[PDB]
Symmetry: none
Subunit: 77 residues, 3 copies
Amino acid sequence: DQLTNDKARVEVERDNLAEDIMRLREKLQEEMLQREEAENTLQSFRQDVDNASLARLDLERKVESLQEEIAFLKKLH
Amino acid sequence: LTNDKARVEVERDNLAEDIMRLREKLQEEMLQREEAENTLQSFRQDVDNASLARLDLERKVESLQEEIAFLKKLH
Amino acid sequence: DNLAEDIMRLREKLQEEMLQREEAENTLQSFRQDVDNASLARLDLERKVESLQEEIAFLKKLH
Ligand SMILES: [Cl-]
């Protein structure tokens, strides 16, 4: 009968909508995870950069000292 | 046949709830995305500053090397 | 009918978010390369500074 077919069809449409929403949800969650990993990696990079800043500071101090010494040695000559 | 209407109302209500949750999670995702963006720009600034600083440091080191060579030539 | 449309809308917005995230991770990779290069240059400058200290010590020994 056409009635049962129409009923089944309506149910199928409902199922399509629900599935579509599920598809969006899951993809969104994938984006969430990837975002999280990206954040972690970026933070590691932050740490690395900060350490590099420390080392660079030390090297700059050393270079200043060397500049003073060279300055004096040039004063001598 | 009011039951037929009731069932439809139930289905639509459930679908509506799903849509809501989807919207909320999407909004949160957008917020976190904003966060990540700001953190990214900040990190870029840090990288640029670091590069500039060590460029200056490189030039200073080179100048030091030159002065050293010049002083060593006097001996 | 506000379900089949609000679904397409959220889908489009989601796609935009995905593209955004892609651009973001690209930028992140670029940052990775930057970090590597920075490390190389840093080590190089460290060795240079060491050498400078040695030569300075030499010049000081000459006096
Ligand atoms: Cl450095």
